[PDB]
């Protein structure tokens, strides 16, 4: 059922690896071999023909193996493959072939951990396939075009979720075509699981636990999550746990306060509500807070742009040289701590993934990096690049 593709410039050993992991052809496409305790299927100038084959993988596969040649190091040819493979939200696992038994900066290709393999004698193959297979559980049931931005609204019953959607969809900039499809400024969007939020009126709400769980599945399926709070009734414990789940899952978040028409708006009421939110949702300092009214339509026009902005940052891919300049600047600004007699050293940093943006800093010892300092590095990356609306992950790793 899961489909796997091997992509890379010619002469990296794709065919050799393919033939090994491929069993027989199917009633074009191949099933995985018997020697594998994993069940899946396989799919079979310079730029022109790389681009075509890469775009077949990005179109047909669920997981892509990006293969390079360990004997050569990173070629400029490999770099153009990488640049093309940035175009997909589909998981890419990096395979460094022809290492019959010294992996550095393949990281530099920006897909994180390289997996050293050998078509020769299956060395490193267990690890590669484990990494490929980990992504299987996350393969979407409902599959939309890559261009589509999927998002969801969540919040307690009668916050105004249905009302927001309708006001939003009633805008001049929108064309509407279990999920709801539409375009805004001609960009394709999907609101995940709009059936779930409109199940009231069909059905009495006897408990909230199924709705909670059903909302977590929509979050799993989304890239941006709109956490909608009730301006009138204020914040509650249920709001934090779900927002907590969204943040933990690495989703872009925007916080929406609805029913703002119904609040006794003194000059400072908004700032106070903003501060209250920051205090209760301390893990969402990246998420912007939008005040609006689904009823009077005040500031409804600000929602979509925030969702767009948050989706962009969520999938933002930084250039390495700039990233390293930013981290050096930070260490120069704020020298690294000493943890039990030894000082932390940072050598290099690269982005390893998007959605959310994740970075690996190579260090002396990941133990010596305090969480506070990791938080400090996070803030300087944000200062430099923006990243509003999305969490970022930072990992310390030992060279070697
Ligand atoms: N040393 C070594 N050579 C390999 C390995 N895998 C493939 N080759 C050789 O590298 C060349 C490329 O093989 P092929 O599978 O056709 O690569 P492709 O161009 O990516 O399809 C062939 O001559 C293979 O014999 C490997 O793991 N180690
Ligand atoms: N004052 C005010 N009432 C609202 C607003 N949005 C929704 N409501 C009301 O709150 C109730 C809940 O609306 P609904 O969209 O069904 O909540 P949902 O469960 O989140 O979908 C309805 O009576 C709405 O008329 C708003 O912006 N201001
Ligand atoms: Zn310490």
Question: What does it look like?
Answer:
- This protein is α/β, with parallel strands linked by helices.
- The protein has 3 domains: 1-141, Rossmann fold (3-Layer(aba) Sandwich); 142-316, Rossmann fold, CATH 3.40.50; 317-400, GMP Synthetase, Chain A, domain 3.
- Helices cover 34% and strands 23% of the residues.
- It has helices at residues 14-21, 46-60, 76-85, 125-134, 161-169, 194-197, 209-221, 237-248, 269-280, 303-314, 320-333, 371-385; strands spanning 3-7, 22-25, 29-32, 41-43, 63-69, 92-97, 115-116, 149-154, 174-176, 180-184, 187-191, 224-230, 252-258, 289-291, 338-339, 342-343, 346-353, 358-363, 393-398.
- The strands form 4 sheets. A 7-stranded mixed β-sheet has the order 2-3-4-1-5-6-7, with helices on both faces. Strands 9-10-11-8-12-13-14 form a 7-stranded mixed β-sheet, with helices on both faces.
- α2 (46-60) packs parallel to α3 (76-85) and α11 (320-333) crosses α12.
- The chain is globular, with a radius of gyration of 24 Å.
- The protein starts with a strand and ends with a strand.
- One guanosine-5'-diphosphate is lined by residues 10-16, 97-98, 100, 118-120.
- The PDB classes it as hydrolase.
- The entry lists the keywords GTPase EngA KH-domain, hydrolase.
- It forms a monomeric assembly.
- The crystal structure of the B. subtilis YphC GTPase in complex with GDP.
- The protein is GTP-binding protein engA.
- The organism is Bacillus subtilis.
């Amino acid at each position: 059922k899961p489909v796997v593709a091997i992509v890379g410039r010619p002469n990296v050993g794709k065919s050799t690896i393919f033939n090994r992991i491929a069993g027989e052809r199917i009633s074009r496409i191949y099933s995985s071999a018997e020697w594998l305790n994993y069940d899946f299927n396989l799919i079979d100038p310079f730029l022109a023909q790389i681009r075509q084959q890469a775009e077949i993988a990005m179109d047909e596969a669920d997981v892509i193996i990006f293969m390079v040649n360990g004997r050569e190091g990173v070629t400029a040819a490999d770099e153009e493959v990488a640049k093309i493979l940035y175009r997909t939200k589909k998981p890419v696992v990096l395979a460094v072939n022809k290492l019959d038994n010294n992996i550095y900066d393949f990281y530099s290709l920006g897909f994180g951990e390289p997996y050293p393999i050998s078509g020769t004698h299956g060395l490193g193959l267990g690890d590669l396939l484990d990494a490929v297979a980990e992504h299987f559980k996350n393969i979407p049931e409902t599959k939309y075009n890559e261009e589509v931005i999927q998002f969801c609204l969540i919040g307690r019953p009668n916050v105004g979720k249905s009302s927001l959607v309708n006001a939003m969809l009633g805008e001049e900039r929108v064309i509407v075509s279990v999920d709801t499809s539409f375009t805004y400024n001609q960009q394709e969007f999907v609101i995940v699981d709009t059936a779930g939020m409109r199940k009231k009126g069909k059905v009495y709400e006897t408990t909230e636990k199924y709705s909670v769980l059903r909302a977590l599945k929509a979050i799993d399926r989304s890239e941006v999550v709109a956490v909608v709070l009730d301006g009138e009734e204020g914040i509650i414990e249920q709001d934090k746990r779900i927002a907590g789940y969204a943040h933990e899952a690495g989703k872009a978040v925007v916080i929406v306060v609805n029913k703002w028409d119904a609040v006794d708006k003194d000059e400072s009421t908004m700032k106070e509500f903003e501060e209250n939110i920051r205090d209760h949702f301390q893990f969402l300092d990246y998420a912007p807070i939008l005040f609006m009214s689904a009823l009077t339509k005040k500031r409804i026009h600000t929602l979509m742009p925030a969702i767009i902005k948050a989706s962009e940052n969520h999938s933002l891919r930084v250039q390495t040289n700039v990233l390293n300049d930013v981290i050096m600047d930070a260490v120069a600004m704020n020298p690294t701590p000493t943890h039990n007699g030894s000082r932390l050293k940072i050598y290099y940093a690269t982005q390893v993934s998007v959605k959310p943006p994740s970075f690996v800093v190579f260090v002396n010892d990941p133990e010596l990096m305090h969480f506070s300092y990791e938080r400090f590095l996070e803030n300087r990356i944000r200062d430099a690049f923006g990243f509003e609306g999305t969490p970022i992950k930072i990992f310390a790793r030992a060279r070697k």
